Structure formats: structure tokens, C-alpha cells
């Protein structure tokens, strides 16, 4: 009645009607929803279980509430602030509930064991822009006692975007010992939702796997355990509705939703965010593969489909598809019209008084496998920008430099040399020192003292430059390459870098795009045995745009992955 199911097909074009006029229809829905019923909540009020709660206004409704085993003699021990909600035809699948506090942290474990929980979601950083938003309510190491739960962490993975912990948990007396996987999303921004849902898609994927398919509800919790929760919660029961149905209903389960708990899905932009995510999902199918699998994937990706005239490999990258960096006075900073910098991700320079855009170089933050922004992503270097190049590594601590093409191919300058050889070179306020020049079959090392005149300090810059990359095409071989890969990483641990390398070809997308997803690839076959190179693409994607310009690229990727795989 009056909010119907969406076919998968209409998604598109719905999600678009919604945020129309500066989402206005998508407001009007949002403000609508209304379980209206009446509930209760005497327990949350409860003196004693008021301090219980991290925000007043943030309580459990009595009918949905889940319930603690009493403790004898202590009133009030039955109550932790947490509802279970619903999924698609899964009921109870999930309990949100608040970020525990230092006073409930015994409350919250008792719940996981009491529930039979295998996972927790954690939907925050324990602190963003200075405010906590949750206490650490988990050991640094070891073993900790909370209530009468031992709980011993096993193991931290921490990535990118995000964190998984292991943990053994043990009430004294039985034998029983218990496995918990805590899964820390940690790239929510500060203020307001992603600007794309591609990282909290793939943090979805692992903790669906992960979820033992016999488990107590999911725990999911934020900081109130409404907001940012009930996001996590729509997008995963609406991935589940759309396997055997083929329609979402954001609205209707939004609707349910808040007859379990107050507030779900807290704000106009997470409902909108509900919507690209879900839009997004329904975009790219399941491009993750196991080691072992991976050939065989190849293979497939090799053949042309009875039905199709191209390649499943070309269909598949078919699938993938600027503020300041248009101000009229950084228009000649740019290489290309079509290629500039996403303003979210882009790298400012310090602005220096009085020169307007002297912030502005194209280039752009990456994230790696392992930290955020492990990468700039930059075109080659204009002689006009060739000062701000030097300066935009001095500012932001990257002292390893990939340079992906000839200074010439093709017969077109494809980069200007921006670094000095036989002498000294002083680019604005950095002295740059040749100090040696490595030729190695399929690159060269150049290696180079940056000294600030303003202030007599000094940092080692290495520049590894690809000379082996066909002038057409792309290699045969992802031999080369993979060792070139494996040489700047080398170089970055070996001498201790905590900045970002920067990467760049000509316009800094295709190749660059290639060097990067494959650094962040292979670590990962390392580390998981699993290898999803779309996924990595979209992600760079999200970043910077075009990176892996052509279909060769992709599938060089995957070759190089396969070849890898051969060691």
C-alpha cells in the first residue's frame, strides 16, 4: 500500500526519481515511515539501568529488547540497551545495540554468549574527529575478564578499510570455549555517509562469509546503534531478499525495522546511501576467486559465450562503467582535459599567500591493501608542474616515485624530464642532488638527495622508471613487472617509509592504474589466497577516475596474478 517493492530492473531509475530536485521525493519517503504503534520501554528507564545507556534518547524498546540472564541479588541485570531486528524472512537475524560503555562492557559479552553469537559488526572507529564514539570494550592482547566471560583475542587482521579480530571466548566453570570474529569497518566518514559504497560492499562480503550460516543473531552496533547500524542492516537483508526475489523494499524494511528499535536508519542520507549501495550490488555479481580457482576462472574469462561476440574477460571490464581541478588558473596543470583529479581524494598542496590555485597538482590519493592512501596517483610531470611535482612529495613524505613510460614513446613526449642528471636542479625552495642512476634490465633506479633551502633539511627520493612496457600493448610476460613491483616494495620497507609512493605514467591512470592494482592484488593472494581484481579496479575507481584504462590492462592483471601464482 502506497510504497511497493522495486523490480532490480526499475533501481536505477527509481534511485534517480528519489534524489531528483535535491531529494526531495527521497525526503518526503524518509519522513514518512511509521511503524505506528506504541511501545514501551520501562527497562531503559529503570534508575539503574539508566547510566546503562549512551545516550538517554537512545533506548530499547521493552517487546524487541534482548535479555540477559539475571545475576542473583542484582537488580537490573537483566538489561543491556539492544533490540533484535529482523532481516529478509530472517527474524531476530540481527541485535543492534549501542557501542558498549566502560560499565557494560560485562553486559555485552555476556549478550554474544548468551546469544550464541558468532560475529559482531562494528560499525565505527572507537574515536572520530576527536569525539568518542565507543569504548574499547576488547583486550589489547591475550586474555581479559569481563563479568565472568574470558575473552582471549586469537588475532587481529587490520586492512585498509577495515579490521577483523579473532576471539576464543570461555565462562568459567564449563569447558565450553566459543570463536568470535569481530569484523571493524573503519573508513565511515567523520561527517555524513561514503561517497561510494564500494568499501563498505566488500567489508559486507567478508563478514557474510565469515558468519557462520548457524550462528546466533549478528551483533551490530555503532555508537548509538541506530545510524550507521541500521545502513549495515537494510543493505545486507535487502542482498539476501534480491537472491530467490529479484525486488528491494528499502521503505518496507526500514518500516519494520523501527518497530524493533528506535531511530533505524537515522538520517536522510543514510537512506540514501541504503539506495546506491543496493544500486551498486546489483551492478557486479561475485568476481572473487580462489587461488586454486583461478585459472579456471581465466579460462572462462578466455572464451567467447554462446551468445555473446566478445570475451567473458571484456564483458566483465565493461562492467566497471573536479572543483579545483577545473578553476580556470590550474586548466594548464593538467594533461588532459578528461583526466583530473576527484576533489575528495585529490592531494593540495599548501597554499602559498597570494598565488590562487597554488594548491592544486593532478593527482590523487590510493589506498593499498594494507593502510589508506599508500599511493599518489599523478600524471607525468609538465614542465610547468614539474616544481610542484617535487613539492607535493616534500609536503606530503613520499620518497618513492614510480614513473611508468619513456620521457618519449610513439614518437609524442609522454613526460618532461623533471629530475636533474648531470647537476644539480633547484625546483623552488628543494635543492634535488643526482647522487646515482641504476640500469637494470627492465628499469632504471635513480636516486636523489632533496635538500629544503628554507630550513637545511634532507630526504633520500628514489625513482624506480619502467622502461619494459611495450610502446602498443601490453607485456607477454608479467615477469618483469612482478619483480618491478616486488623491487619498489623492497625499497619501501628496507629503508622505512611510512609516505605513500607515487605513481605515475603520462595522463597517470592506465598504467598507473595496473602498477597499483596489482601491488594491492598480490599482497592479497599473499595473505588470503583469494584474488578479486574487479574489485580492486572498482575501488581505484573510487579514487581516482579511469584507472586501468583498456582491456588489455585488465587482462595483463590477470595474467600477472596467474603468473604469480606459478612461484
Known sequence: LSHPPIPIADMAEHTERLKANDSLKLSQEYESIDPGQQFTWEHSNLEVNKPKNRYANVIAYDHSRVILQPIEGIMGSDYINANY????????????????????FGDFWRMVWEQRSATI????????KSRIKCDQYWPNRGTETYGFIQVTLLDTIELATFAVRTFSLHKNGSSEKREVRQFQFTAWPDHGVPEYPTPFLAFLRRVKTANPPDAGPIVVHCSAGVGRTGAFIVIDAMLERIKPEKTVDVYGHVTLMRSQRNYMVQTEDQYSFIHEALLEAVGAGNTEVPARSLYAYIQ???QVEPGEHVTGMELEFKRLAF???????????????????????????????????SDYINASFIDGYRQQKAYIATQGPLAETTEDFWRMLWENNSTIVVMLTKLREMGREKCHQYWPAERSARYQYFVVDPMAEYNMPQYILREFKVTDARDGQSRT????????????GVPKSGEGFIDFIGQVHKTKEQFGQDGPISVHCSAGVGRTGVFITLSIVLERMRYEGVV?????VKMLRTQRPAMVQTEDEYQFAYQAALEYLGS
Request: aromatic residues 10%.
Open 300 to 302: 572462462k574469462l578466455a
Open 323 to 357: 572543483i579545483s581541478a577545473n578553476l580556470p588558473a590550474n586548466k594548464f596543470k593538467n594533461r588532459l582535459v578528461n583526466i583530473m583529479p576527484y576533489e575528495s581524494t585529490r592531494v593540495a598542496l599548501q597554499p602559498i599567500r597570494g598565488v590562487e590555485g
Open 121 to 128: 559488526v562494528m560499525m565505527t572507529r572507537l574515536e572520530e
Open 85 to 104: 531486528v529482523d532481516g529478509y524472512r530472517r527474524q531476530n537475524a540481527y541485535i543492534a545495540t549501542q557501542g558498549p560503555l566502560p560499565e557494560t
Open 461 to 472: 627520493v628514489r625513482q624506480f622508471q619502467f622502461t619494459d612496457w611495450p610502446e602498443q
Open 532 to 536: 578479486d581484481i574487479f574489485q580492486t
